[PDB]
UniProtKB/Swiss-Prot annotation, chain A:
GO terms for molecular function: RNA binding; structural constituent of ribosome. It is found in: Cytoplasm. The lineage of its organism: Eukaryota, Fungi, Dikarya, Ascomycota, Taphrinomycotina. It comes from Schizosaccharomyces pombe (strain 972 / ATCC 24843) (Fission yeast). Belongs to the eukaryotic ribosomal protein eL18 family. Component of the large ribosomal subunit (LSU). Mature yeast ribosomes consist of a small (40S) and a large (60S) subunit. The 40S small subunit contains 1 molecule of ribosomal RNA (18S rRNA) and at least 33 different proteins. The large 60S subunit contains 3 rRNA molecules (25S, 5.8S and 5S rRNA) and at least 46 different proteins. eL18 interacts with NAP1. This is Large ribosomal subunit protein eL18A. The modification Phosphoserine is found at S15, S63, S135. It holds the Pfam family Ribosomal_L18. InterPro entries: Ribosomal_eL18, Ribosomal_eL18/eL18-A/B/_CS, Ribosomal_uL15/eL18, Ribosomal_uL15/eL18_sf. The keyword Oxidoreductase does not apply.
Swiss-Prot record, chain C:
It is found in: Cytoplasm. This is Large ribosomal subunit protein eL20A. It comes from the Eukaryota. There are 2 genes for eL20 in S.pombe. One of its GO terms (molecular function) is structural constituent of ribosome. GO terms for biological process: cytoplasmic translation.
UniProtKB/Swiss-Prot annotation, chain D:
InterPro entries: Ribosomal_eL29. It is found in: Cytoplasm; Nucleus, Nucleolus. GO terms for biological process: cytoplasmic translation. Its main location: cytoplasm. This is Large ribosomal subunit protein eL29. The keyword Transmembrane helix does not apply. GO terms for molecular function: structural constituent of ribosome. Residues 1-22 have a biased composition (Basic residues). The gene is rpl29. It comes from Schizosaccharomyces pombe (strain 972 / ATCC 24843) (Fission yeast). Keywords: Cytoplasm, Nucleus, Ribonucleoprotein, Ribosomal protein.
Swiss-Prot record, chain E:
It comes from the Eukaryota. One of its GO terms (biological process) is cytoplasmic translation. Belongs to the eukaryotic ribosomal protein eL21 family. The gene is rpl2101. It comes from Schizosaccharomyces pombe (strain 972 / ATCC 24843). Keywords: Cytoplasm, Ribonucleoprotein, Ribosomal protein. It is found in: Cytoplasm. Residues 112-136 are annotated as: Disordered. This is Large ribosomal subunit protein eL21A. There are 2 genes for eL21 in S.pombe.
RNA sequence: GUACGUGAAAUUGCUGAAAGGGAAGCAUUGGAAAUCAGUCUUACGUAGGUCAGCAUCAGUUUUCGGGGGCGGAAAAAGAAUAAGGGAAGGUGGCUGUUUAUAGCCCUUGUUGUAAUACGUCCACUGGGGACUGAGGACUGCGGCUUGCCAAGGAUGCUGACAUAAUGGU
RNA sequence: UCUAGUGGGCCAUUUUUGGUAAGCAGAACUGGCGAUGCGGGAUGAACCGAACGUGAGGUUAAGGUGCCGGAAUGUACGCUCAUCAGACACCAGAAAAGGUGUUAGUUCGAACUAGCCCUGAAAAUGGAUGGCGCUUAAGCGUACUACCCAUACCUCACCGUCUGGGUUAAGAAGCUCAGACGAGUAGGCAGGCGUGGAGGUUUGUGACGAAGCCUUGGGCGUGAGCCUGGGUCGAACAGCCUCUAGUG
RNA sequence: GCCUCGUUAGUACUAUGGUUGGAGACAACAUGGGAAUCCGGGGUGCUGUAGGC
């Protein structure tokens, strides 16, 4: 008899992608070797983000990449941008700067605009040749909580989260508990 | 080829001379206490010996029906299992910890033989959170080498004399997993040592018990 | 197996008591740990000393100077019973103070069902004069002592072939 | 049994009596209104003066 | 049961014996800043601004300062978590924690020892240590001869 | 064979075997009886089936023995041998006394750095028994004198039977 | 973040309220039982000890060592004789007051004071220190050794889980190294076994016997199961990858 | 009267522990913490700012 808090404690981690994509598994197999044969935190983080799921890999945008790489001091220069996820176009920006992005997927609009205006689009394996240790690479992430679910998570009294309502209007969770004229506001 | 053997040959003798110095220190301290006691007897006065700074605690009770405070303290002592032993630096904070869990553990003053055979026969290190036995001096050097603890004898000296790095040495040592005492306990095991039991403080009597479990 | 211990101790010095008094006790205990416990037990009831605010300044194991000489020991004890209002004086004849105390503890437990915790030894004194001596102890002191050997039940040796002589 | 508090402290400590997370900045809102107003103006000038110095 | 604000407050909000009358004015002449660690001791004479009986004897950190009161933040165990309780308590029910002042005095002393150690080129161990076991020492018997004691015979004092 | 493809179980009769003193069934371990497979025979002095015995070792453990260091009142004692003291539960002597024709008790000296007991320790040592042999070229840490080694987990020398012998049902 | 079950509890320690009391009603703190086997208390849900993967060896806990029953008819000192003695906590029950019973004490022969025994003591099927029996005990009190043995401890083997470390020379979904650990109702999750039908596949099996059935034959797997020898039988059926469901 | 020190007193009480004692009430012991009244001694305001003498 031993006084141990908990036995056989796996914490939370994913060891392989739940995806059955053959090419994703090929990239994972590459970055398994790269992570464990190099001391690169970059390679380890790329391997972990390849394991991650769709909600944990939000899409990044052309303009967001341009915004992050053009931040006054920055010194982003010609350093390649790396995102483990999809790069979506932003129609609102009318001129796309010369950019270098390595990503799992580029939308057809985003890939066309990047190639038409300046730089190049790379896959994560081609990045593994140019920068096998991830040197001079700007690793970026999408906004995880821009997802609609987080607009509802944590709903409660005085939390200012969106309720799950079937329609929007004056008849739909707007009277009692939502204003002082009907009893209380909560 | 021979460059390595020469360099380690030098390192091994550094270990040997420090072990020789430590043993000389043990002998000198033992002699000094004896002579000081002899002087007190001859002159008719009384010599109060140095109170022990080192304590060995054995968990004698199992893991059932324990109050939360005693259960917390024994967890802090790393006494998770019955017949588990630990070396403790004895001070005011430790004294009132052992006071609370006195019905559940026994403790006393370890001698040189007790410390030596505990680390030799039941010596396991906490190497990358794993219970790795102390079968080579490289294991101890790879963990405690930043404190100039290079050998088993260096670890024994740090434990026995309560050196400046006693916390690191004690936490490096895995909680000793002692067997049941050969010959048994007393008739009633969960009284105090004073009232005929085997729980509580027992001073120099912890050495006979440890030699029963080794 | 009890042992006689000379236990000397004092409270730790303070501003009120820079030079505390040394108090010594002769007390019988199986080991030094119990001897120190009983010393603090007796000093605590009398003279405002804890174990915490005091210290054991000397420990000594006293052996019998004349362990091969038959002696008579008179022991005064405080006996605590279901009523607990008792003092006793008993006499035991043997060669050592330790044995007399051990025989006292066995006799006291046998006759009065008193335990080690209940009994506290007031004083153990050697009675030297025959006139100073219990009737049974005196009649052991008889110069002409002689008596037959009492019954003593005399490997496994089951199934004896002959009926025993027992004489 | 209508009421008892027997197993409740055990249930509390299984996940522990957890403490709220410590943040360096607490809301200057929800404080004194006059202090909040002036601290807005004081902060606004501070960030501008840092920007001008830079 | 009754569940009023001051239920079962007969002894805790009562003013001390021969301590009744008028509140001393050093209470009002004290200054409190946000971050100050203060003790709450509800003075029964001042009924305005009295915190609930739970907070009597509770120590917290000042978070807000007003004209006549102090905002104290206290962690209260509610089920399985500490919840932040922000009581607006009048300054009569408040006093500075001497533990904080002792800590700040110790911090000033520690910096002083560190500066003198650096100036001297020495290293000073600034951690407090628990009470160690007593050192070896001689005890003299001259004019302090031991007095042999025996347990006293039982007697009926009354 | 129409009571008709196949033809289960419950339940029934026959036969064989077995069991049984007021339930039966089950689990565990082995015996007995019946039954049966693997393995082997070969392949290349070499290696090879099953089961035993012993030796030399390793791991674990139990049980006995000897030697030595050290500690305490630097045991207490005691013996032997010099002072003095006291006496008895009074010996020779004559109930009473003081080593004589028995002796004992107390103190001191001595023999003495006495011994023993107890405690503790030896990286000092001699035996006996038990269980286990995981791993499978080489590395490592060490001792010896490069080879050797009891040093990062059993090998060596044999015998019997190759059998229902082991093993299973 | 989403969601299950739960929202009849009960017992013990200690504190405490209502009550004549209760195996009564009510709370506080903790530990348990419920949900939990094992060693022990003859037997018992909460008592004692100890909490559980499959095993070998060693050693203990609580408790025991006359025989049932593994283990000293051991050691030491007493007490007790009971005309229906006593014998181990919880616990399965008895008091005042006495007793020329007896053993020890206390204080001035007298009183007291204790320990054991007896009296007080008293039911209904025949029966309960568990039984047999036990008297310098195999009873009681104390002391000291040896011994017995739990699924607890220790060493080791194996299984699984988790954790950590390697592996571009290895169905990398693979291989390899190390350490810790293993009870479970309600309940959650994961990986597997079995059944009918559909797509693909296997030069797939089959009247030289498919499917089914019977079997004191053999073999595999922790298991769900699977394969096979022999017998019967006579027309179809299966492995693998996926799909599906009126699937155990 | 009040304030302080000692006494009370390691006393009362108390946390923990026992297959402790006792029919119980309760008690003892073990490892710890530790009062109050009576009583006796001493004491009978100290100090900050601005000033006057």
């Amino acid at each position: 008899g031993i006084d141990i808090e908990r036995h056989h404690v796996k914490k939370s981690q994913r060891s392989k992608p739940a995806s059955e994509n053959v090419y994703l598994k090929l990239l994972v197999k590459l970055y398994r070797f790269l992570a464990r044969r190099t001391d690169s935190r970059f390679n380890k983080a790329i391997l972990k983000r390849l394991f991650q799921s769709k909600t944990n890999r939000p899409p990044i945008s052309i303009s967001k990449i341009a915004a992050l790489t053009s931040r006054k001091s920055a010194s982003s220069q010609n350093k390649t941008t790396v995102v483990v996820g999809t790069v979506t176009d932003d129609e609102r920006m009318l001129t796309v700067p010369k950019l270098s992005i390595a990503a799992l997927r580029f939308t057809k609009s985003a890939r066309a605009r990047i190639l038409k205006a300046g730089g190049e689009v790379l896959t994560l394996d081609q990045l593994a040749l140019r920068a096998p240790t991830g040197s001079n690479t700007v690793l970026v992430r999408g906004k995880k909580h821009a997802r609609e679910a987080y607009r509802h998570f944590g709903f409660g009294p005085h939390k200012h989260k969106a309720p799950y309502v079937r329609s929007e209007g004056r008849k739909f969770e707007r009277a009692r508990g939502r204003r002082k004229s009907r009893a209380f506001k909560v | 080829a021979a460059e390595k053997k020469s360099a380690r040959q030098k390192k091994r003798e550094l270990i040997a001379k420090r072990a020789e110095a430590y043993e000389a220190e043990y002998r000198a301290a033992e002699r000094e206490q004896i002579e000081l006691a002899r002087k007190a007897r001859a002159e008719g006065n009384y010599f109060v010996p140095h109170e022990p700074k080192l304590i060995f605690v054995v968990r004698i009770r199992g893991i059932n029906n324990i109050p939360p405070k005693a259960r917390k303290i024994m967890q802090l002592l790393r006494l998770l299992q019955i017949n588990n032993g630990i070396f403790v630096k004895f001070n005011k904070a430790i004294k009132e910890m052992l006071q609370v869990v006195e019905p559940y553990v026994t403790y006393g003053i370890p001698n040189h033989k007790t410390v030596r055979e505990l680390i030799y026969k039941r010596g396991f290190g906490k190497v990358n959170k794993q219970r790795i036995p102390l079968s080579d001096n490289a294991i101890i050097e790879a963990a405690l080498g930043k404190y100039s603890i290079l050998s088993v004898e260096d670890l024994i000296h740090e434990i026995y004399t309560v050196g400046p790095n006693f916390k690191q040495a004690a936490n490096f040592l895995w909680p000793f997993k002692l067997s049941s005492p050969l010959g048994g306990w007393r008739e009633r095991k969960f009284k105090h040592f004073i009232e005929g039991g085997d729980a509580g403080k027992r001073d120099e009597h912890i050495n006979g018990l440890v030699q029963k479990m080794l | 197996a009890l042992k006689e211990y000379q236990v000397v101790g004092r409270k730790v010095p303070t501003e009120h008591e820079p030079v505390p008094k040394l108090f010594r006790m002769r007390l019988f205990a199986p080991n030094e740990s119990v001897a120190k416990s009983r010393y603090w037990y007796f000093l605590k009831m009398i003279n405002k000393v804890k174990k915490a605010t005091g210290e054991i300044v000397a420990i000594n194991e006293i052996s019998e100077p004349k362990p091969l000489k038959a002696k008579v020991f008179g022991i005064w004890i405080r006996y605590d019973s279901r009523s607990g209002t008792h003092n006793m004086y008993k006499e035991f004849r043997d060669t050592t103070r330790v044995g007399a105390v051990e025989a006292m503890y066995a006799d006291m437990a046998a006759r009065h069902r008193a335990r080690f915790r209940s009994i506290r030894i007031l004083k153990v004194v050697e009675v030297e004069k025959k006139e100073d001596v219990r009737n049974y102890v005196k009649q052991l002191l008889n110069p002409h002592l002689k008596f037959p050997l009492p019954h003593r039940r005399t490997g496994k040796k089951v199934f004896a072939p002959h009926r025993p002589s027992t004489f | 049994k209508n009421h008892t508090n027997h197993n409740q402290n055990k249930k509390a400590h299984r996940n522990g009596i957890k403490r709220p997370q410590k943040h360096r900045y607490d809301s200057l809102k929800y404080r004194d209104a006059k202090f909040r107003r002036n601290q807005k103006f004081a902060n606004r000038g501070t960030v501008e003066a840092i920007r001008q110095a830079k | 049961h009754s569940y009023g604000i001051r239920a079962r407050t007969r002894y805790t909000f009562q003013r001390g014996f021969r301590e009744h009358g008028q509140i001393r004015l050093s209470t009002y002449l004290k200054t409190y800043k946000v971050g100050d660690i203060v003790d709450i001791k509800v003075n029964g004479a001042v009924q305005k601004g009295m915190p609930h009986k739970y907070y009597h004897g509770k120590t917290g950190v000042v978070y807000n300062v007003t004209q006549s009161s102090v905002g104290v933040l206290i962690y209260k165990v509610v089920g399985n978590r500490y919840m932040e309780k922000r009581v607006n308590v009048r300054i009569e029910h408040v006093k500075h924690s001497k533990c904080r002042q002792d800590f700040l005095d110790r911090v000033k002393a520690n910096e002083a020892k560190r500066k003198e150690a650096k100036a001297q080129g020495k290293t000073v161990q600034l951690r407090r240590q628990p009470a160690p076991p007593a050192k070896a020492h001689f005890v003299s018997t001259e004019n302090n001869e031991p007095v042999t004691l025996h347990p006293v015979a039982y007697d009926t004092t009354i």
